[PDB]
Design an enzyme around this catalytic site. Structure first.
Site, mmCIF file in Angstrom:
data_model
loop_
_atom_site.group_PDB
_atom_site.id
_atom_site.type_symbol
_atom_site.label_atom_id
_atom_site.label_comp_id
_atom_site.label_asym_id
_atom_site.label_seq_id
_atom_site.Cartn_x
_atom_site.Cartn_y
_atom_site.Cartn_z
ATOM 1 N N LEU A 131 2.977 1.807 -2.167
ATOM 2 C CA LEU A 131 3.200 2.116 -3.576
ATOM 3 C C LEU A 131 2.040 2.890 -4.199
ATOM 4 O O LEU A 131 0.889 2.548 -3.989
ATOM 5 C CB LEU A 131 3.436 0.825 -4.359
ATOM 6 C CG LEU A 131 4.571 -0.065 -3.863
ATOM 7 C CD1 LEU A 131 4.640 -1.346 -4.674
ATOM 8 C CD2 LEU A 131 5.906 0.681 -3.923
ATOM 9 N N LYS A 173 0.816 -1.202 0.000
ATOM 10 C CA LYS A 173 0.000 0.000 0.000
ATOM 11 C C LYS A 173 0.853 1.257 0.000
ATOM 12 O O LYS A 173 0.358 2.352 -0.243
ATOM 13 C CB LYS A 173 -0.946 0.004 1.203
ATOM 14 C CG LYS A 173 -2.003 1.089 1.145
ATOM 15 C CD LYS A 173 -2.832 1.130 2.428
ATOM 16 C CE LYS A 173 -3.961 2.143 2.314
ATOM 17 N NZ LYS A 173 -3.415 3.493 2.005
ATOM 18 N N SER A 196 6.843 -3.668 -28.255
ATOM 19 C CA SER A 196 7.761 -4.435 -27.401
ATOM 20 C C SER A 196 9.107 -4.750 -28.068
ATOM 21 O O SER A 196 10.144 -4.792 -27.400
ATOM 22 C CB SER A 196 7.094 -5.733 -26.938
ATOM 23 O OG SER A 196 6.680 -6.497 -28.062
ATOM 24 N N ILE A 213 -13.961 -9.275 -30.756
ATOM 25 C CA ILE A 213 -15.050 -9.430 -29.801
ATOM 26 C C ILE A 213 -14.639 -8.752 -28.510
ATOM 27 O O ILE A 213 -13.715 -9.200 -27.846
ATOM 28 C CB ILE A 213 -15.346 -10.895 -29.462
ATOM 29 C CG1 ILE A 213 -15.671 -11.716 -30.726
ATOM 30 C CG2 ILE A 213 -16.472 -10.964 -28.453
ATOM 31 C CD1 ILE A 213 -16.144 -13.145 -30.402
ATOM 32 N N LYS A 257 -6.657 -7.409 -0.523
ATOM 33 C CA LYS A 257 -6.649 -8.593 -1.383
ATOM 34 C C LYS A 257 -5.282 -9.259 -1.361
ATOM 35 O O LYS A 257 -5.159 -10.490 -1.374
ATOM 36 C CB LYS A 257 -7.086 -8.218 -2.797
ATOM 37 C CG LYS A 257 -8.587 -7.922 -2.904
ATOM 38 C CD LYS A 257 -9.016 -7.640 -4.345
ATOM 39 C CE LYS A 257 -10.522 -7.646 -4.492
ATOM 40 N NZ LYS A 257 -11.158 -6.584 -3.658
ATOM 41 N N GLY A 280 4.006 -9.913 -28.857
ATOM 42 C CA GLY A 280 2.657 -10.380 -29.096
ATOM 43 C C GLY A 280 2.257 -10.112 -30.534
ATOM 44 O O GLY A 280 1.378 -10.774 -31.073
ATOM 45 N N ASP A 281 2.899 -9.126 -31.159
ATOM 46 C CA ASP A 281 2.663 -8.859 -32.565
ATOM 47 C C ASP A 281 3.795 -7.997 -33.108
ATOM 48 O O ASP A 281 4.800 -7.774 -32.425
ATOM 49 C CB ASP A 281 1.329 -8.134 -32.751
ATOM 50 C CG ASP A 281 1.369 -6.714 -32.224
ATOM 51 O OD1 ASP A 281 2.337 -6.377 -31.519
ATOM 52 O OD2 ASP A 281 0.453 -5.937 -32.528
ATOM 53 N N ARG A 296 3.186 -16.420 -28.885
ATOM 54 C CA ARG A 296 4.187 -15.348 -28.846
ATOM 55 C C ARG A 296 5.082 -15.445 -30.058
ATOM 56 O O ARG A 296 5.209 -16.512 -30.649
ATOM 57 C CB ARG A 296 5.081 -15.510 -27.627
ATOM 58 C CG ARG A 296 4.334 -15.726 -26.330
ATOM 59 C CD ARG A 296 3.813 -14.412 -25.854
ATOM 60 N NE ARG A 296 4.905 -13.460 -25.709
ATOM 61 C CZ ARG A 296 4.733 -12.150 -25.584
ATOM 62 N NH1 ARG A 296 3.510 -11.639 -25.588
ATOM 63 N NH2 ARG A 296 5.782 -11.357 -25.457
HETATM 64 N N1 LIG Z 1 -3.881 2.032 -24.413
HETATM 65 C C1 LIG Z 1 -2.818 2.682 -24.970
HETATM 66 N N2 LIG Z 1 -2.515 3.973 -24.617
HETATM 67 C C2 LIG Z 1 -1.411 4.528 -25.181
HETATM 68 N N3 LIG Z 1 -0.517 4.006 -26.053
HETATM 69 C C3 LIG Z 1 -0.862 2.720 -26.376
HETATM 70 C C4 LIG Z 1 -1.981 2.020 -25.866
HETATM 71 N N4 LIG Z 1 -2.053 0.715 -26.371
HETATM 72 C C5 LIG Z 1 -0.999 0.636 -27.173
HETATM 73 N N5 LIG Z 1 -0.240 1.822 -27.228
HETATM 74 C C6 LIG Z 1 1.038 2.091 -27.884
HETATM 75 C C7 LIG Z 1 2.227 1.721 -26.974
HETATM 76 C C8 LIG Z 1 2.406 0.230 -27.379
HETATM 77 O O1 LIG Z 1 3.676 -0.257 -27.111
HETATM 78 C C9 LIG Z 1 2.222 0.343 -28.908
HETATM 79 C C10 LIG Z 1 1.874 -0.987 -29.575
HETATM 80 O O2 LIG Z 1 0.685 -1.505 -29.007
HETATM 81 P P1 LIG Z 1 0.467 -3.111 -28.741
HETATM 82 O O3 LIG Z 1 -0.986 -3.415 -28.652
HETATM 83 O O4 LIG Z 1 1.105 -3.792 -29.991
HETATM 84 C C11 LIG Z 1 1.316 -3.654 -27.221
HETATM 85 F F1 LIG Z 1 0.915 -2.929 -26.129
HETATM 86 P P2 LIG Z 1 3.169 -3.855 -27.279
HETATM 87 O O5 LIG Z 1 3.692 -2.866 -26.172
HETATM 88 O O6 LIG Z 1 3.734 -3.731 -28.619
HETATM 89 O O7 LIG Z 1 3.436 -5.300 -26.715
HETATM 90 P P3 LIG Z 1 3.046 -6.664 -27.398
HETATM 91 O O8 LIG Z 1 2.424 -6.215 -28.647
HETATM 92 O O9 LIG Z 1 2.196 -7.554 -26.445
HETATM 93 O O10 LIG Z 1 4.375 -7.474 -27.586
HETATM 94 O O11 LIG Z 1 1.190 1.314 -29.051
HETATM 95 MG MG LIG Z 2 0.129 -3.835 -32.122
HETATM 96 MG MG LIG Z 3 2.958 -4.850 -30.216
HETATM 97 NA NA NA Z 4 -11.140 -9.444 -28.074
HETATM 98 NA NA NA Z 5 -0.662 3.685 -2.279
#
Ligand SMILES: Nc1ncnc2c1ncn2[C@H]1C[C@H](O)[C@@H](COP(=O)(O)[C@H](F)P(=O)(O)OP(=O)(O)O)O1
Ligand SMILES: [Mg+2]
Ligand SMILES: [Mg+2]
Ligand code: NA
Ligand code: NA
Ligand SMILES: [Cl-]
Ligand SMILES: [Cl-]
Ligand SMILES: [Cl-]
Ligand SMILES: [Cl-]
Length: 326
Positions: free
Chosen positions: A53, A51, A171, A97, A63, A180-181, A140
């Site tokens: 943090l 807490k 990433s 979805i 929790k 992830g992509d 992945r």
């Molecule tokens: N909600 C958001 N708010 C602000 N910037 C965002 C957001 N969502 C994505 N971005 C920006 C910042 C994200 O880094 C980038 C790509 O979004 P990806 O959906 O591909 C995901 F997060 P990645 O980090 O690439 O990890 P991996 O794809 O699981 O391996 O867009």
């Molecule tokens: Mg993406």
């Molecule tokens: Mg990505």
């Molecule tokens: Na979905």
């Molecule tokens: Na806190």
DNA sequence: CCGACTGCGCATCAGC
DNA sequence: GCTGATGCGC
DNA sequence: GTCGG
């Protein structure tokens, strides 16, 4: 993974709140607490310690106390055994979805992969593709394949026009050993905040990538954003690679630093940084950083010559991509 | 206490 | 057709 | 669900 148990729990809670409760602030609150605990360099011995943090409150601390003592969360045990919640959580795993469509399908009695498959005519295009590649999309991507993918994308974009610059962000750009992509930032000298001196800039790249059979499907496509599916070529006799999600974002060339900051992420790092900006009287998006007027209206875009310039405005020491994985 | 919570592209739909 | 709201996802 | 003022 110091506190893997706790962060998992909180992530599961965030998912429940977004997917089932459709409570977006609780979802964001949980993700925030999970993220702050993930970076905390000590094995958390108690809720009270957690807490301390920022982003962890009394409810989460409590929790965490339950989880530490018993190894689980009664609240989550029950959620898991609830058919409606379980079903809704599953259907949201299909790209396209979301929480609403999931609940609608479950109402209609569509709640399994089988159901989805036999009711394909009830899905929009995005959903249909998500169902198509359901398994693949949960796999992945090894950085080694990301490197192969990068090489293709960069070379094919070069073939369309040597003036394009394509940068792989997400990433991958943060140094992750798996993604992830694939996220690709694209610029061309002809598209600036000042004008669009050439049409179909993004389309032309998408086409070429389709022509060489790298891009295989399309989730959505506009003038500045493409969301689709791609696949590496395999060799003679070799099993094929899984299909992969690919996103492409075309950004004004003069706004590259704001764009690459955005697309590098993480999503939570962005949220955190944008929230801090507001506290310093700025607003940051993928195009510009602007000051906030006394009234609250965003002012004019400030000069940006590097990612560090952006950090500088909001009085943050610069952080390398590899250090933005929140 | 209570307002505010990062910021935006594309698909789809209602209301006109 | 348009615009504005909402869903979904970056 | 958490926090700042
Ligand atoms: N909600 C958001 N708010 C602000 N910037 C965002 C957001 N969502 C994505 N971005 C920006 C910042 C994200 O880094 C980038 C790509 O979004 P990806 O959906 O591909 C995901 F997060 P990645 O980090 O690439 O990890 P991996 O794809 O699981 O391996 O867009
Ligand atoms: Mg993406
Ligand atoms: Mg990505
Ligand atoms: Na979905
Ligand atoms: Na806190
Ligand atoms: Cl909420
Ligand atoms: Cl649990
Ligand atoms: Cl910029
Ligand atoms: Cl802007």
């Amino acid at each position: 993974t110091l506190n893997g148990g706790i962060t998992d729990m909180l992530t599961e809670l965030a998912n429940f709140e977004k997917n089932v409760s459709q409570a977006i602030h609780k979802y964001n609150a949980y993700r925030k607490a999970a993220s702050v605990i993930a970076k905390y360099p000590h094995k958390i011995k108690s809720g009270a310690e957690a807490k301390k943090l920022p982003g962890v409150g009394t409810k989460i601390a409590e929790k965490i106390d339950e989880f530490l003592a018993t190894g689980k969360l009664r609240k989550l045990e029950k959620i898991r055994q609830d058919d409606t919640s379980s079903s809704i959580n599953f259907l949201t795993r299909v790209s396209g979805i979301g929480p609403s469509a999931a609940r609608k399908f479950v109402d209609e009695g569509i709640k399994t992969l089988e159901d989805l498959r036999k009711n394909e005519d009830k899905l929009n295009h995005h959903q249909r593709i998500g169902l198509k590649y359901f398994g693949d999309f949960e796999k992945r991507i090894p950085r080694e394949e990301m490197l192969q993918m990068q090489d293709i994308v960069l070379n094919e974009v070069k073939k369309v026009d040597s003036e394009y610059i394509a940068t792989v962000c997400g990433s991958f750009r943060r140094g992750a050993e798996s993604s992830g992509d694939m996220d690709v930032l694209l610029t061309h000298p002809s598209f600036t905040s000042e004008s669009t001196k050439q049409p179909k800039l993004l389309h032309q790249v998408v086409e070429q990538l389709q022509k060489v059979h790298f891009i295989t499907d399309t989730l959505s496509k506009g003038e500045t954003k493409f969301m689709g599916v791609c696949q590496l070529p395999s060799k003679n006799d070799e099993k094929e690679y899984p299909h992969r999600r690919i996103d492409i974002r075309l950004i004004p060339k003069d706004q590259y630093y704001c764009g690459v900051l955005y697309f590098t992420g993480s999503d939570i790092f962005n949220k955190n940084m944008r929230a801090h900006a507001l506290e310093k009287g700025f607003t940051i998006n993928e195009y510009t950083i602007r000051p906030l007027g006394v009234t609250g209206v965003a002012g004019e875009p400030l000069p940006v010559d590097s990612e560090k310039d952006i950090f500088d405005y909001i009085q943050w020491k610069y952080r390398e991509p590899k250090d933005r994985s929140e």
